[PDB]
């Protein structure tokens, strides 16, 4: 076929020409699929072998069924990612190879109950939750420091502030750090079409601060669109589970004390205004370490400042190189 070979040359030429163009936006996957095994790809052999919970970058537009993208790994080339409708179509192909998909069981019962597949056997139903396979996540995952206890107290604030200072100085010219006083745990996507569109409604949500929470969500996306590294300084985060179900998916960096005895001796030497909060502070210390390590992204358990700083720096440096 002369049509497939000619469109192959044009597609390859487009990839070479577009290899030096700015990145437009990014999405996040949640299903295990391969971009090479599919026979509908316009270019064969240049697919992506991605897995569940992977990050892809999109630069230009191809069509309503396919897109051009590249991985976030070091030295990642350009691959093709199926469209959400195409992924929905290929999801239906995964559940059709089975013997049955609707109500009629095939337990040696053939010839009596035909039972044509109703709407319950298609994608029209099962819309109670309808988790989207593709989500419009920010262009990069933000960096957040959490623990070992609640923020706003003396024991906690300098440790992140000094760590922010080291990140700011080492990444001079490529860092943009801002303090978000608004809440970040209420970043929802399937609540309503437009919750509190106007502030003059004088409703429960119109007069509340919820509209401020969602307004800051788009600010992060635009800030992440600048390609510069961003670290959030919010003090409304105490557990990765509160931000786990959000679309931000930040880099959960956990710094922890080696022993509770070490922490309970640091609080004593701080000042009389801090032992009043010792009881509540110790509550967060035990509940945060009870979270499994795999929930967090990178751990900071070193007892020396120099050991942890470059341990975190190399994780951030490799991300900068891999995403370029």
């Amino acid at each position: 076929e002369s049509a497939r070979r000619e469109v192959e040359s044009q597609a390859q030429q487009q990839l070479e020409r577009a290899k030096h163009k700015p990145v437009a936006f990014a999405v996040r996957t949640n299903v295990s699929y391969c971009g090479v095994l599919d026979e509908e790809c316009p270019v064969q052999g240049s697919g992506v072998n991605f897995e569940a919970k992977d990050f892809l970058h999109i630069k230009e537009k191809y069509s309503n069924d396919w897109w051009i993208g590249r991985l976030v790994k070091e030295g990642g080339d350009i691959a093709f990612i199926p469209s959400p409708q195409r992924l929905e179509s290929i999801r239906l192909k995964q559940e059709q190879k089975a013997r049955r998909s609707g109500n009629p069981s095939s337990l040696s019962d053939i010839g009596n109950r035909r039972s044509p597949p109703p709407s319950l056997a298609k994608q029209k139903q099962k819309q109670a939750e309808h988790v989207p396979p593709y989500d419009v996540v920010p262009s990069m995952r933000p960096v957040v420091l959490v623990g070992p206890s609640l923020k706003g107290y003396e024991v906690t604030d300098m440790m992140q502030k000094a760590l922010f200072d080291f990140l700011k100085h080492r990444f001079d010219g490529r860092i943009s750090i801002t303090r978000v006083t608004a809440d970040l745990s209420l970043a929802k996507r399937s609540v309503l079409n437009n919750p509190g569109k106007r502030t003059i409604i004088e409703r429960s949500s119109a007069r509340s601060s919820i509209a401020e929470v969602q307004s800051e969500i788009e600010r992060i996306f635009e800030l992440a669109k600048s390609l510069q590294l961003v670290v959030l300084d919010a003090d409304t985060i105490n557990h990765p589970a509160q931000l786990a179900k959000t679309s931000l998916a930040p880099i959960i960096v956990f710094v922890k004390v080696s022993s509770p005895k070490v922490l309970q001796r640091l609080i004593r030497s701080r000042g009389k205004s801090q032992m009043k909060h010792l009881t509540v502070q110790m509550m967060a210390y035990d509940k945060l370490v009870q979270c499994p390590p795999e929930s967090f992204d990178v751990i900071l358990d070193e007892n020396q400042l120099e050991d942890a700083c470059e341990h975190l720096a190399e994780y951030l440096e490799v991300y900068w190189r891999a995403t370029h």
């Binding site: 300098m158 080696s258 070490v262 640091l266 030497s269 020396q304």
Partner: peptide
């Protein structure tokens, strides 16, 4: 574990 977590916890602001 205490010496490294005491100077750093105070020198950031003080």
């Amino acid at each position: 574990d205490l010496k490294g977590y005491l100077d750093w916890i105070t020198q950031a602001e003080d």
